[PDB]
Assembly symmetry: C4
Homo-oligomer: 243 residues x 4
């Protein structure tokens, strides 16, 4: 695998993929984290969208954002997804790094904006950040993240279009709706355990704005968890020999 | 951009686009505002559809109504959407104004009908109208509306069909389901802040029937917010150079 | 319009359309009414699927059942839908009557089965039947039903395929998912008012098994309401000149 | 029907179908059972995803997993589905048995993993296992399972693609989303009665890990129920003469 292919010299489009990933990840974090705070700060019992509403916000936004960005960047919005595709040789090392930089920067800004708009409740209620919940230990959280990310990266490899790519690249287009639903499904099982990471940029962004020691102690789980899940899904895609 | 193109002299279809936008916006306001009142007036705790149900009503109706009207008018049902497309040169100034007139008239009637059917609870519970919620100030509400409308108008520009248009026009057909989901997603994050406007006609219609001074004080947010969000999404569509 | 066309002499397929409508309507009533009783009989607060879950059951089943029956019968599962299409000249008088007989018989059986399986709670909690709720009067209920059925029959006329028909007929295939969502959307607004009819067979079936005088007093609303809504949607389809 | 066809001598693909069914069923049980435990163990009233969230987890995962596995194995993830298709002569006896072995093994592992990750709450709250709920007797549970499985297997026969098959087989591809929704719809009606089986491997897996005498007493319902539902749906598919 070289570090880069001729398609990274199409600098106009490469720039635009990066921007697309950047903005999408912002949008992602803003809408989802704002749904979290608004639910946690509600005084009325059942006066909110509930944990259900919060799972839809994550799944729904991924659907919407992959829909919008699949023909521009490939619609990753998530370093573990970019990592998995990189393992499967669909992304060069150079586009992979440019993508995770964009995704993490975008993630920080979105959580940023959510704090700007409601600082009080943002800090009081966890700041949207991921961590090990009471009653589970680290290895459980890690297993949960490995397996949840496997479910998302396995759906992504089935959602790849074998013939169509993003503008001026060989990066596959992705069917937005199954991927969105997998995100949704994994939240309904994972919110009680880690809040659900399965997206290192989404976990990184909330750690950066929330800035708590508890949160940062846990943060390794949400890189290693997902990256391992991603790698096991790549291994599986290649072994059920199907790209 | 001229004020009008030869397709506005196809008066039969132009008339029918306008009617289509008018009725859709009625339908929109009636179903969504009626879901709001029915939830707010319920005596049982969790005896309602909840804020979740209320977000589906907005997202779902947009999906249904864009589905029905995309080949007739282009399926805008929302002046900020018509404004955005106008900025992007997909709509002439003349069809744009005819559309927002239709959308606002339709919006007033739908909220009208919801009051006709349940006057007591309609007035008692906020009348479905948008405003700045306790604990947020005006600039926050405005930011929330800018960004929420950006998410909807960004999804709309990705949902445009580059080859197919509404009857007897060059106005693009739109993929109803991503647009509906974006409406849904933006509510789950915005209902606690402004109730969610992102649609000047939807905010205008509830202000007109509810008629409260509090509500009218706030009403500028729900024109300026969305129109700015719309303009920033147009700017972005044109810069990620993709119509 | 003759009373019947040569396609009603294809007796094999005509028989099978009727059976298809019959069974679908059973399935419809069984799953939806069983979701109602199971929710109403739950002792735990928020221990149920909620009014939200109940709206999905109606919308979801319509989606599933139109999906299954659209190429066999046209996927009506609802006399107001069959009535509307009949008005628009897509169904002969003879197939229309055969369809509503099948739909009402099927509806009675499904509610039948729900009573068979849980007689205690079935009778105690309203028996799934439609009626005017406390705090609304008859004209409101009727308006609600007119307009809710308009929303469903308007979505159905946009969901008609202009080129593809059900086996051995000129009855149009229907896009199941927008129609299902319209059913869903109309429930979120109507459950507090009448429980939502918008389907005379669904209202007739629950009236027949529940058998209460209150319920039967109201039952005219759920024929006249929907049939009027259906007729206004046909009138509109023909005037926005679009079959 | 012979016991096997030349397509079971394509051992590479046959092996891979089996693995695909195996892993999918694991994924299925892990995500769904983990959503159950996380909901049942929550201390806050409405602090969970609710019975609604739990129904989405089952429906959603089936959608996601049929999406991923339809072109590899045919996307059954459920012995009653494999049984039904076997009755309809779409699956040989030999692939049918290999599939249910894979499905049951996979089911056991998924519930396995859910216990590994949260042993305390897993055992305390029912272990995700199916059984007859208080207030219903065995024949009711059985009827509920017959009919619920009929709804799923009837949707599956309408979701079969008549022209496209899984890799190196004559096993039909299936439209994932109607099948997923039917699973969802059947839960909203059945969760109060048996928890919803309609999948012998899903019931078998939770019986094996939970290991309770109550649960095992009931377990016959969740084989006989679904297999009968499946057989009645096959009979119906063949009689509404439509494969």
């Amino acid at each position: 695998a070289p570090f880069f292919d001729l398609g990274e010299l199409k600098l106009w489009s490469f720039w635009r993929a990066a921007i697309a990933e950047f903005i999408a990840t912002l949008l992602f974090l803003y809408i989802t984290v704002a749904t979290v705070i608004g639910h946690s700060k509600e005084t009325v019992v059942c006066g909110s969208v509930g944990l259900l509403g919060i799972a839809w916000a994550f799944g729904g936004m991924i659907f919407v954002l992959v829909y919008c960005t699949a023909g521009i960047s490939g619609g990753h919005i998530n370093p573990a997804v970019t990592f998995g595709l990189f393992l499967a040789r669909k992304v060069s090392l150079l586009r992979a790094l440019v993508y995770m930089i964009a995704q993490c920067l975008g993630a920080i800004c979105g959580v940023g904006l959510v704090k700007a708009f409601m600082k009080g409740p943002y800090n009081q209620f966890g700041g949207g950040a991921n961590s090990v919940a009471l009653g589970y230990n680290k290895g459980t959280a890690l297993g949960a993240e490995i397996i949840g990310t496997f479910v998302l990266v396995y759906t992504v490899f089935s959602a790849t279009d074998p013939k169509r790519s993003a503008r001026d690249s060989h990066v596959p287009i992705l069917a937005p709706l199954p991927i969105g639903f997998a995100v949704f499904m994994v939240h309904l099982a994972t919110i009680p355990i880690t809040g659900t990471g399965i997206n290192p940029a989404r976990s990184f962004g909330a750690a950066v704005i929330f800035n708590s020691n508890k949160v940062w102690d846990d943060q390794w789980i949400f890189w290693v968890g997902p990256f391992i899940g991603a790698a096991v899904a790549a291994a599986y895609h290649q072994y059920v020999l199907r790209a």
